[PDB]
Amino acid sequence: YRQSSATSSFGGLGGGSVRFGPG
């Protein structure tokens, strides 16, 4: 238990906004 902000992968939404291409 290192009091990590986040673990595993989930798109990293918490880190910042999700980058989208020419959708």
Side-chain angles (χ1 to χ4, degrees):
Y1 193 79
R2 297 181 67 81
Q3 296 180 42
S4 177
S5 180
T7 181
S8 189
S9 297
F10 60 88
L13 285 76
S17 297
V18 177
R19 187 175 295 175
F20 286 78

